[PDB]
Amino acid sequence: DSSRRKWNKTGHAVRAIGRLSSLENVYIKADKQKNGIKANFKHRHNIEDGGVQLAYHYQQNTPIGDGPVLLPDNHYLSIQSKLSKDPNEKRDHMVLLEFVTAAGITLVSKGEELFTGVVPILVELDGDVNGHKFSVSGEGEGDATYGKLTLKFICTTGKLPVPWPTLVTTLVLCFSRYPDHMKQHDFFKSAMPEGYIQERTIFFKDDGNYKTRAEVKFEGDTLVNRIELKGIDFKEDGNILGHKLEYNTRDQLTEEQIAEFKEAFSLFDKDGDGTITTKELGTVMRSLGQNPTEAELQDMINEVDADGDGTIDFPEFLTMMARKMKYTDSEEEIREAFRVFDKDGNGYISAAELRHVMTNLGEKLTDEEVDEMIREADIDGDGQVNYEEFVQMMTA
Ligand SMILES: [Ca+2]
Ligand SMILES: [Ca+2]
Ligand SMILES: [Ca+2]
Ligand SMILES: [Ca+2]
Ligand SMILES: [Ca+2]
């Protein structure tokens, strides 16, 4: 509870740099050739018994009508999803709560007027994955003022043959909250009421892919999303057809954990003003042996900068860190963190390697306290920290 403390804070600072170096959002760009947009993003699915299944999405949107649309400057959407079960529902089902917000641009079409209140939604999907066919129906509502969606889905053909989480992205970005300074970048609402075509290819790493085509348009008062999905090349006992994905990634976010995050926060926020600047982030990254440019520091901040002020405020930090504990890191990401300590790449963090990190981070730590830290993590007693020991110390 003091060697452990030194691991938690140092670990969380390396984790924060790993988040700030990653691309977790939905990246939107103009596609003038199709009078629409393109998007790309990496989605994480936690594997129930440990690890993560990545799903790489490519996306295109094209207007159904000929009316004028808004072609955006580059920006991203930040999406938080919560999946649950209706305790009264006997059918194979998913309850989905989503918040969708536009950001990434530092400090109103006629279609936007259709979204000022609560709008009912209907969703219909026909799928075929490796010849396993299915249908999904969904219903609920969207409130774009807040970016909020509540949807319940039923598998109307009986048993869903893929995990529910793998259909979330497929099963209405017209409900995004765009801030006042980004209204001209909201392609989705500008296409309404006639609507847009949304097409994706979704590559499940080390597995098969989904292809999707959807029509998103008003049908009277209701926003309808009608989809066809085709999956190919899935492995019979991979994560998808094997049902090895976690359903419900719980927001179980303790007070001990927030406090840990604040200790790592304050390692960056060295003037104690409650925000991290580019100068502050760069100081810590240099001390860890990295050498980012000003432009890279600005792009790292912009990835988690919800208010567009160019700094990571305390609450923006707590949000980014919560999400980093909710979804599992890839092997590549955990090795990268490991390498910050394992300087010589021999697979073992030595007392000398850890002393070097700790005293570069400005923590004054004796011979004796360094040994205490190794001892805290050193399961097999060899006096070093190997990869699997590092993983144990890093996990909650
Ligand atoms: Ca500061
Ligand atoms: Ca900010
Ligand atoms: Ca602020
Ligand atoms: Ca080493
Ligand atoms: Ca060891």
Residue numbers in the entry: 38 to 144, 159 to 222, 226 to 450
Can I see the authors' text?
Here we constructed the prototype of a photo-switchable Ca2+ sensor based on GCaMP5G that can be switched with 405/488-nm light and describe its molecular mechanisms at the structural level, including the importance of the interaction of the core barrel structure of the fluorescent protein with the Ca2+ receptor moiety. We engineered a prototype rsGEI based on the conventional Ca2+ indicator GCaMP5G28 by coupling cis/trans photo-isomerization, which underlies the photo-switching, to Ca2+ binding. In the present work we introduce the concept of rsGEIs. These sensors show photo-switching only when bound to the molecule of interest.
We further mutated rsGCaMPs to increase brightness. The reason for the almost sixfold increase in brightness of rsGCaMP1.2 and rsGCaMP1.3 compared to rsGCaMP is apparent from their crystal structures, which show a I71H-enhanced water network and a direct effect of V107T in stabilization of the ON-state chromophore. This increase in ON-state stability alters the switching kinetics only slightly. For rsGCaMP1.2 we also elucidated the structure in the photo-switched state, which confirms the HT finding from rsGCaMP1.1. Overall this suggests that rsGCaMPs may be engineered using similar strategies as for RSFPs.
